Amino acid sequence: GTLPAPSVTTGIVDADIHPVPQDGALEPYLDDRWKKHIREYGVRTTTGLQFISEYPQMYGGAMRADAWPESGYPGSDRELLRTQLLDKHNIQLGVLQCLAPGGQTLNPAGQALNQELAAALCRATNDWQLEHLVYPDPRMRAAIPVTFETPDYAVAEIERVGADPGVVAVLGTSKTLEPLGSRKYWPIYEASVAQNLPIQFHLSQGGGHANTGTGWTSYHTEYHTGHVQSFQSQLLSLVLSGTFDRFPTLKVMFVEGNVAHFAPLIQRMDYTWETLRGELPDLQRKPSEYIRDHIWASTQPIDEPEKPEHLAELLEEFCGDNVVFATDYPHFDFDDPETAFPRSFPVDLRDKILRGNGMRFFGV
Amino acid sequence: TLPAPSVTTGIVDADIHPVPQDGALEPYLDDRWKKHIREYGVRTTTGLQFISEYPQMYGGAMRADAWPESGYPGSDRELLRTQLLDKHNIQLGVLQCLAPGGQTLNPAGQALNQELAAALCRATNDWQLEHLVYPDPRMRAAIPVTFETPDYAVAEIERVGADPGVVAVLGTSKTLEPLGSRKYWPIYEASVAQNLPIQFHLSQGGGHANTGTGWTSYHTEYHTGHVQSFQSQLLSLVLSGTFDRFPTLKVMFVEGNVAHFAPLIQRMDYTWETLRGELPDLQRKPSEYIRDHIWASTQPIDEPEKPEHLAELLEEFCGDNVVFATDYPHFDFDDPETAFPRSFPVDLRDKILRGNGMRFFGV
Amino acid sequence: VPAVVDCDVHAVLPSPHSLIPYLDEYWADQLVAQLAPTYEPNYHPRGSAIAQHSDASVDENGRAATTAENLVKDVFADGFTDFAVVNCLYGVQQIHQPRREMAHARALNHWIANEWLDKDDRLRASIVVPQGSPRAAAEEIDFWSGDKRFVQVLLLGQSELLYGREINWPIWEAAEAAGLPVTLHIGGVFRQAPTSVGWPASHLEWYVGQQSNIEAQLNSIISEGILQKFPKTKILLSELGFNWLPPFMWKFDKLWKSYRPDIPWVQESPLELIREHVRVTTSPSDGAEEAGRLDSIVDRLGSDRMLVYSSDYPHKHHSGPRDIENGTHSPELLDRIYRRNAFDLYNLVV
Amino acid sequence: GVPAVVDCDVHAVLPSPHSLIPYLDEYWADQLVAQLAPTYEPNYHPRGSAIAQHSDASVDENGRAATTAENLVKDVFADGFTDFAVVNCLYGVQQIHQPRREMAHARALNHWIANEWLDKDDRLRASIVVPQGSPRAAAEEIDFWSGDKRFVQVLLLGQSELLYGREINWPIWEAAEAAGLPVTLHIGGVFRQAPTSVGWPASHLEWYVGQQSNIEAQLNSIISEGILQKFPKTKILLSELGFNWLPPFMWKFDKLWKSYRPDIPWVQESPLELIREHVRVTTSPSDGAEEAGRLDSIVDRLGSDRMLVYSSDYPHKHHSGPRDIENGTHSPELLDRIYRRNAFDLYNLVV
Ligand SMILES: [Fe+3]
Ligand SMILES: [Fe+3]
Ligand SMILES: [Fe+3]
Ligand SMILES: [Fe+3]
Ligand SMILES: [Fe+3]
Ligand SMILES: [Fe+3]
Ligand SMILES: [Mg+2]
Ligand SMILES: [Mg+2]
Ligand SMILES: [Mg+2]
Ligand SMILES: [Mg+2]
Ligand SMILES: [Mg+2]
Ligand SMILES: [Mg+2]
Ligand SMILES: [Mg+2]
Ligand SMILES: [Mg+2]
């Protein structure tokens, strides 16, 4: 396809938007064998459950109550997404992260245990989002889900559509079977860099392990707060593995992992490394020195300190140039660009969170 | 140039456990990895500095009579020769080095630093060829490689896999993904390219608990539980169609027992008769892959209450695909003179002691 | 005269809304406000060939075994079966929130009592328990022990910790006190990979391979001392096969001989303990229905007392409930399988 | 009566499993020997790595620090500043899968601490090591030592088999409360799943840094499941797990408790307040809070000056030392709270 590069002018970047295919919208893009397989088996993943994930959403699917269209699931109505989000907030680069093949919140195609099905669902999702959403309205651009757990298939999909100007990133999950610095994933990083694509890792369930490093959570506070933990672990692996020494142009964004907690995590990483760096003598930089060039984080759901001045402090302690606005439309903890930041928040930092920082991540 | 192995009047022993003497791997390890081991040891899937999660019970799980004057059982090549090779006329004895030092089971490939793991596998391979195989080529090496980092395993198979002192690639019964996963396919491709079969030996570790439903408590559970991993691996390797992609690949399950594979395979077929539509690309009926692709070694020999049931079950598995092993020097060593029941048929035992292993190893 | 008991048939919950009449307002309202996520398990995917045979009666959505009328019509039509033991596999055990697990397990048992046991006196049922909290599981057993139409405790083949762990002893204690066998049925909580080598990539791989977890459970139960501590314990393996038992039994016996002082309370051989305390349902038969193979497996088990007839209704298996007759020449053995062996479990007469 | 300067985390290092033999019954002592005495020395502080011991610590005949009370006491108390030290032995009994052996070796380990440490210097106190694979057995171990007040807290590892708030683990919290003892979580683990939610860290360094994530999980479990309402006198010490990570975790936990309170209706106070009142944290490692102004900053972000308690983490080597925290604050008052006043809440030890 041919499409101008995204232009962010007076508008803003929204790094996380969740569209969902209407019932049947993927079938034109799937082989008959996979339509039959889905009819007969559904999409088996790391659960013993036919239709839901291991932590189903608490209240109304975790969607804002005003984003339900005439008929479908929130995010399934393109016109509603235009007026409720892109028009309303003057979003000029809205990055699509399709988290499910259907109207069933949070069930990523890449996590199907049949990885041939997973690949087929990712490919169908990519063809669909480009045809149905991006090309009709190129304010939207795609973060293309691929099968991180089967790198050969991911590399093939990145080669197939990764150079399409409608695509701006590769889309993975926060949870994986091996930490993301593992050599398993390096072929995907190689293919991404060859297409000059950054990678976004969105909050997920699944992965193959429990949702903490020390057991499965019980209550919803534990589950939702627990999502940050996976991102902490992924940051440590990606940095300490030397992945960014091997791929010195690779850019990664943690999406919906919060921001502020990264600052003291990185601080502890440096402090520990000062004593124990002999274990990993090839690493070229002090661990925190990788952040500026390699690690981004989106804002939603915004951190809410008790004293608001601590927000800007912690965002700058992470890296003020590497924080990128997202709304998470249409989820219930959606953030509004006009109200997400504290009244006292520095205007220059807010402006670059809304514009410059994401432009630099997405190569605009 | 090392002669090819020749089995005439003697036998195949598919599982022998030598151990490097202290310091014996150092000439084959880069100084950086020497330093790493001095400072960190060999960290794996435990919170333990020196032992695995299920350390051995009595006497290190070694034969009480296999201790050399100094060092660990399996560490003295002259005692290996006199107590094993000469004593049982072993003419193809396949070395499976399970530890880089004086321990019973701590595999190099399972080090969580996979660069270290690769260096230890490489050092083990150079060591066993120089210390054991070339000096006494009745022995041949099953080369440990890093199954969890296929690029490094492929490199090592390319490096040494064509050496005539090598007869197999060596993996572990436990892995992070079932062995039919595409992750391991580059290793199968490289092994086929070197005309090498693969042996998977009983292991701890892998990344998961030692059963699919929790960690075991007592030694009966731990040791009987080793069978479970091999059941799971057989199902994955077959049902994944790995042998459709690699129609010449041979794999042997080592120290997983044998008889249990027969009812497992029987259940696999019976279930597939109903549920085959989930995996329409699999070319054959599941049990039909066994004859051409799946071998099993005998130790510790199955001991049914009615001995006649052994031959029945070995044949229900596949009588041509069962291969003798002693497991020297572990405590549950099988003596080829006594391991089989009195009424067992000579032809089946002969195949197990000779022809079957010769076919698997290409001898 | 011992009754012909079908030792494993299935009730299928229509949807979580069917639980509403049996939940307190807090849980009924929370259910509707959550948009009623269904914990329907994937153990028998509803669209796959195992889920129901083509002769089974179906409801308006094309699903078998969602009503007692449909199940009783099909199961009892031919007059051979006297009683049937209902297991509902709805996935309350995969509810992580522990109070909700308790509340939905209790509601599910109420639904079984009111919409199944009350509707036909030939039905019996297992007690579904919140196995994430063994204390609460014991209380669920105690609560239903008064209703003798509940004839066993339901546990899944894959648990969070092995069933012989002391953490789980309250379940075995409560079952023994209630005079109830404990059944393990295929299925699981999926709180680790279903195998020791990771996640099966298909339902078929998963289904076949769950036998390995039952070896683990039996070794844990016996080695940890359940059968000495709770010596009246009876264990039924439901819909988990059985041809794998003898090779497991022989190796367990061999290693018990080697490790006796590690588990000194196990003074009888695992061979004898398994033959005496473990029973197994016959559907699926996993090939034992072929000529001579039922006599063979009984010879290999060393006991004709373990196998108990089931149909596994409404599931479809390669061979049917009575095709086991083709594997034996012994009417005495068939008498044991069809009626006498289950008398040890349920003491049900015609 | 002035609150004492308590070093709230120092370590005894078991020389080898043979040191347990005098405190094991014949069945277990003979068994240990016959098994060739496999050592459950953990890999949490690899003996050959830079964290294991200060270069100038007193050492035994094998070059190892902290294997005798004589050596530890010589070093810890030399400068006269410390009044008491709380000894935690991390020998890996919790990684013994065999449950009877876990119980027997935990007991023997506590006897070794009592007889070869607490009896040797009255400035030493200790945690009770418990067999956490059987929570009822852990409760029995706490009870066994509840009459020896030199045992001042219960030791739990940061990574457990099931989360500590689960009802399966309530007997531990019940026993600790009944004994009047705080519970400490110390870095370390049972390793019965991957140490993270995304698999196995590939290095000790990655593992060590990343165990803070498991402590967020543990605190959310403890609080969400109702431990602090069911056992309201509970006190929790986080030992050698950092602390700069707490405020971002606290803020998100509070935000989501507002959203989901009806799921955990017994939690009627914000997690923010429950954490400030029931959780204390040791100061070694300080993870950068020793840098200029950063200790004042983190106390401001915690919203409480009552949580940090002084430790040296002897004999371990960290990037900054026990008293380098003084560089992070301008308040002598804050240092007085960290050095003595905050730990009074845990142990009530006076000079
Ligand atoms: Fe999102
Ligand atoms: Fe969201
Ligand atoms: Fe062996
Ligand atoms: Fe062995
Ligand atoms: Fe069934
Ligand atoms: Fe410490
Ligand atoms: Mg591009
Ligand atoms: Mg060759
Ligand atoms: Mg294929
Ligand atoms: Mg086909
Ligand atoms: Mg009749
Ligand atoms: Mg004594
Ligand atoms: Mg000094
Ligand atoms: Mg507030």
Numbering used by the authors:
A (entry chain H): 10 to 373
B (entry chain D): 11 to 373
C (entry chain C): 29 to 378
D (entry chain G): 28 to 378
Which lines from the publication concern this structure?
Here we report that the 2-aminoisobutyric acid hydroxylase from Rhodococcus wratislaviensis, AibH1H2, requires manganese to functionalize a strong, aliphatic C–H bond (BDE = 100 kcal/mol). Structural and spectroscopic studies of this enzyme reveal a redox-active, heterobimetallic manganese–iron active site at the locus of O2 activation and substrate coordination. Previously, recombinant expression of AibH1H2 in Escherichia coli enabled its structural characterization and revealed distinct mono- and dinuclear metal binding sites housed within the AibH1 and AibH2 protein subunits, respectively.
We expressed AibH1H2 in E. coli grown in M9 minimal medium supplemented with excess FeII, and subsequent purification furnished protein samples (FeAibH1H2) containing ∼3 equiv of Fe per AibH1H2 heterodimer and minimal heterometal content (entry 1). Fe occupancy in both the mononuclear (Site 0) and dinuclear (Sites 1 and 2) metal sites was evident by inspection of the anomalous dispersion maps obtained from X-ray diffraction experiments performed on single crystals of FeAibH1H2. AibH1H2 had no detectable activity upon the exclusive incorporation of iron ions. Initial assays to determine the enzymatic activity were performed by mixing FeAibH1H2 with the AIB substrate and sodium ascorbate as a sacrificial reductant under aerobic conditions. Subsequent workup and gas chromatography–mass spectrometry (GC-MS) analyses of these solutions revealed minimal d-MeSer production. Since the protein structures of these two samples were found to be identical (RMSD = 0.34 Å over all atoms), our findings suggested an apparent requirement for one or more Mn ions in AibH1H2.
